[PDB]
C-alpha cells in the first residue's frame, strides 16, 4: 500500500529539489567566477534567482514537514473571522509569477457578493488554495492559447463552497478515487516531466477535514478538472 509507492516518492523528492538546486549552484558559481563580467543589474538579477529558487525549495520542505505534522496529528488548527474574498485575491497574487511562467491566466469570480465571512484558519486555507492553484498551473495543457485556473466562490448548505476550475489535461476515472492519497501521482506521457511528491492534495484533504469540511473532484480527460472545497461557518 504505502510501502509500494514510498520508493517512487523518495525519487520524486530528489527530482523536485534538484531543479532549484541546479539554479542555485550554477548562478552562485557564475557570480563567484564572473565578478569582472557582470554588470550591476545582472549581478542583482542573478542574486534574485538564487533567492527565488531558495524560496521554492523552502516551500517544498514545508510540504514535507506539514505532511509529517498531519500524519502525527500534531497540527492543531486555530479558527478566526476571515474574509475569503481577500484570502482568494491574496492567494492568486502569490501564484501569478508561476502562472505566467507556463502561460496560465488566473481568475476570480464570486457568485455571492463580497466580502464573505467565515470562521477558518487563514494560514491553512491559504495553503489549501495555493496547492489547488499550483496544481491548476502544473497540469495545464501543453500547447494551448487559452489556459486558465479560476477560483469560484459561493455560499451553500450553511457553509462556503470554493471551486477551483481548470481546462488542463484532466484526470482518468480510475485515478479520480486516488489523487487525494499520499504519494499518488498519475503516471503518463502528459505528466512525465512535471515535478511533484503526491503530497499536496493529501495535505489539502487533511486540512479541509480538520475544519469539518470535505474536498472532492470532477474531471474529464482532455477537458479539465473542478475541485470543490466545502467548509461550514
Amino acid at each position: 500500500r504505502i510501502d509500494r509507492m514510498k520508493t517512487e516518492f523518495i525519487a520524486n523528492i530528489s527530482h523536485e529539489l534538484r531543479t532549484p538546486l541546479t539554479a542555485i549552484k550554477a548562478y552562485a558559481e557564475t557570480i563567484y567566477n564572473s565578478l569582472g563580467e557582470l554588470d550591476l543589474s545582472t549581478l542583482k538579477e542573478f542574486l534574485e534567482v538564487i533567492i527565488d529558487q531558495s524560496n521554492h525549495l523552502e516551500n517544498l520542505l514545508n510540504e514535507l514537514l506539514d505532511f509529517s505534522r498531519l500524519e502525527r496529528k500534531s497540527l492543531q488548527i486555530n479558527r478566526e473571522k476571515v474574509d475569503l474574498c481577500d484570502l482568494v485575491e491574496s492567494a492568486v497574487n502569490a501564484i501569478k509569477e508561476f502562472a505566467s511562467s507556463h502561460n496560465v491566466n488566473v481568475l476570480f469570480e464570486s457568485n455571492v457578493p463580497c466580502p464573505v465571512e467565515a470562521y477558518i484558519d487563514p494560514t491553512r486555507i491559504r495553503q489549501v488554495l495555493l496547492n489547488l492553484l499550483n496544481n491548476g498551473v502544473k497540469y495545464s495543457k501543453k500547447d494551448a492559447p487559452d489556459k486558465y485556473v479560476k477560483v469560484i466562490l459561493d455560499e451553500k448548505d450553511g457553509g462556503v463552497l470554493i471551486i477551483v476550475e481548470d481546462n488542463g489535461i484532466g484526470i482518468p476515472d480510475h485515478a479520480k478515487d486516488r489523487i487525494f492519497e499520499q504519494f499518488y501521482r498519475v503516471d503518463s506521457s502528459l505528466t512525465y516531466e512535471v515535478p511533484g511528491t503526491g503530497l499536496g492534495l493529501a495535505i489539502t484533504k487533511e486540512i479541509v477535514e480538520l475544519h469539518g469540511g470535505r474536498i472532492w473532484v470532477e474531471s474529464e480527460v482532455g477537458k479539465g478538472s473542478r475541485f470543490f472545497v466545502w467548509i461550514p461557518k
Binding site: L21, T22, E29, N33, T42, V49
Partner: protein, 121 residues
C-alpha cells in the same frame, strides 16, 4: 563566431548557460522543447547542441535519435546536460549519438571546459 543551440524547457537554466556561453564569445540560439529545437535546424546548422532530456512535446532522447537519421545533423556534436542521474540514462544517450553526458547540478566552469573540448578539435 561559434554557434550553439541551447535546448532546455527551463528559462532559468537557459539564461545561466547562455551567460556562460556568451562569456566565451559564442552565439546562442534557444529552444523551449525538442520539437522547436528541430525546427530551428532549418534556419542554421550549429557547431554544438546542448540538450536537456526531460521536456514536454518532444524529449531529448527522441531529438538525439532524429539527429542520427539526418545526414547534416548527425555530425553536430551534442552535450547532454540533464537532471537524469542514472548510468543507464547516460548509456542510452551515448548510444543515441551524444558525445558527452553531464548531470545537473553542474559546475558552470566544468561545463565550459567540456564545451570547449568538443568545439576545439
Amino acid at each position: 563566431s561559434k554557434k550553439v543551440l541551447l535546448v532546455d524547457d527551463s528559462a532559468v537554466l537557459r539564461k545561466i548557460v547562455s551567460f556562460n556561453l556568451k562569456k566565451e564569445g559564442y552565439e546562442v540560439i534557444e529552444a523551449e522543447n525538442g520539437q522547436i529545437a528541430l525546427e530551428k535546424l532549418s534556419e542554421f546548422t550549429p557547431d554544438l547542441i546542448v540538450l536537456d532530456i526531460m521536456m514536454p512535446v518532444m524529449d531529448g532522447f527522441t531529438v538525439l535519435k532524429k539527429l542520427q537519421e539526418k545526414e547534416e545533423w548527425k555530425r553536430i556534436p551534442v552535450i547532454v546536460l540533464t537532471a537524469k542521474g542514472g548510468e543507464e540514462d547516460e548509456s542510452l544517450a551515448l548510444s543515441l549519438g551524444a558525445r558527452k553526458v553531464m548531470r545537473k547540478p553542474f559546475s558552470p566552469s566544468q561545463f565550459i571546459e567540456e564545451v570547449k573540448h568538443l568545439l576545439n578539435e
